[PDB]
Amino acid sequence: YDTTNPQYNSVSRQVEAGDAVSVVGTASQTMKPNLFYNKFFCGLGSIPLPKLH
Amino acid sequence: TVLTKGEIVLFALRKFAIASNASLTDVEPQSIEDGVNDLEDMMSEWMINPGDIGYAFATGDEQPLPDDESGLPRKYKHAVGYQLLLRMLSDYSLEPTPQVLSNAQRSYDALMTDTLVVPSMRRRGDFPVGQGNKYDVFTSDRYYPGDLPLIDGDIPNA
Amino acid sequence: LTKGEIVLFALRKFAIASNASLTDVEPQSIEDGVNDLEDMMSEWMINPGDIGYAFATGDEQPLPDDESGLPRKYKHAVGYQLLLRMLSDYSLEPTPQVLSNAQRSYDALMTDTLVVPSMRRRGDFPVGQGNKYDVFTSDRYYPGDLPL
C-alpha cells in the first residue's frame, strides 16, 4: 500500500497497528497439504556438471 | 639455542655503545623497556612486507618481558638488531655511521636472499595440449587446467 | 592502541619528552597532538584510503584515552608521519635518518592497500562461437562494466 506510487497497490488498506491476525490450522496437527498453482509460479533447473581430467 | 628479546635489545644497545659493558657500567631499564616495545612493534610491522620469519608475539594482552623467548633462529639476530638500532637511534639523538649502514644493508640483503620464493608462470587455461601428449589414454585432456588440477575426486569442488 | 599511545611514540622518537626526561610537556600540548591525529586521518581518508580508524562520535571532542582501532601493524607508519607534521611546531627540523625511516614505513603501509583495478572487456566485443552462445550461455556479446 504505497501512497506515493498507487500504481503497485495489491491490498485494500494499509496494515496499521493493532490489526487482527489469525493462524490457519490447528495447534499441532500434521497433514499432507494439497497444492494449486500457475505455470509460471516456480522454476526448476538442473545445471550440468563438467568433466574432470 | 634460545633467543631472548632482552639479549636482542642488549646487542642493539651495545653495537652502538649506548650502554655497553666495557666503556660504561650502566644499563637503563627505561631503555630496555623502550627497546623491547620497539622490537615488538617492528616485528608486527614486518609481518607483512618481508614476510613471517618465525617471530612469536605476546599472547593475550599483557606486555612483553625481556626474559621471554623470541623464537627467532640465530641466523636472523644480526639483521634484527641492526634494523632495530637504526629505528631507535633518534631518541639518544645519535646519527648513524656509514659502516653501520653498510653492515645493516648486508645483513638485510642476506635475509632477503634467505626468504625468496620466485614463483613460476602457470599455463593460461585455454592453451591447447599437443596431440602427442596422448589424451583419451593418459590423464591429460585437450587443454591445460589453468587452476590447481583435481587431486582426489572425493573432494571435487576444488 | 589508544590515541594517546600514538602521540607518545611521536614525541619519544624525536626526544621532546619521554618516561625518562626530568622535564615533561604540559597536558595542553598532548590534546593538540590528538586533534592533529584526527586531521591526519580525515585527510588520509582521501589519498591513502580508509584504514579502519574509528572517528569520534557526533558532538564529542576526541580524548587521548579513546580507542583508535588501527591494528598495531600500521602503528609505526602512522606515528612517524605525525611526527613530521608536528615536528615543526616545537621549532625543530627532522634528520635524514628519521626521513628514511618514515619513508620506509610509508611504503610498508602502502604495500598493504593495493588495488590493481583489472579493467574488463569493452562491452561491444564479440564472443566467439567457441563459447557456444546458442546453447550453454545466453550472451552473444560481453556483458559490460557491471554498472553501479
Place this chain on the structure above:
Amino acid sequence: TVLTKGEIVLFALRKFAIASNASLTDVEPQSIEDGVNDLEDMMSEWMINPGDIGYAFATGDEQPLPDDESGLPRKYKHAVGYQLLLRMLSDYSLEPTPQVLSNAQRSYDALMTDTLVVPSMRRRGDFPVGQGNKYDVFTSDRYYPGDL
C-alpha cells in the same frame, strides 16, 4: 697448529691496535666473550649467502668458549678476522680506514674464489637424442632424461 675462536678474536682486536700483547692497557674478558659471541652469530648467519666453509658450532645447549677449536683452515683466518673487525669497530665507535677496507675486500674476494662453483644447464627433457647416438641398441633413450 689448529685455529681457534679466541685466536681469531685476538687477531681481529690486534689488527686495528685496540689491544695487543705489546700494549700497556688491556681489555676485560667481557669484551672477549662478546667478540666470540659476535663471531658465532656472524658465522651462523654465513650459512646462507656465502655457503658452508666447515665451521663447527656449539653443540646445542652449550655456550661457545674461546678455547675450543672452530675447525676452519688457516686460509680463511684473515677473511673471518677482517669481517669480524668490520662488524666490531662500531662497538668501540671507530671508523675503518680505506687500506683496511681494501685488504678486507681482497681477502673476501679470495674466499669467494675458493667457494665458487658454477652449474651446468642440462637438456630440457623433450630434446631428441638423434639417430647418430644409436638409440635403438646402444642407448635406451630417444630423448634426454633431463634434470635429476
Place this chain on the structure above:
Amino acid sequence: SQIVLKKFLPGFMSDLVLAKTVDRQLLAGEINSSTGDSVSFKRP
C-alpha cells in the same frame, strides 16, 4: 667409469616343473564371480 653399456648382465634363474606336472585341467575357469570364494568336487 663413465661409459656404460645398455645390456644388463645375465643373472641366475630357477626352473619351473611343478606347475607343469600338477593338474591344471579340472579347476580352470571354475572360480568365477558367481561361484564364490570356494568350489567343491565330488568323491567316488
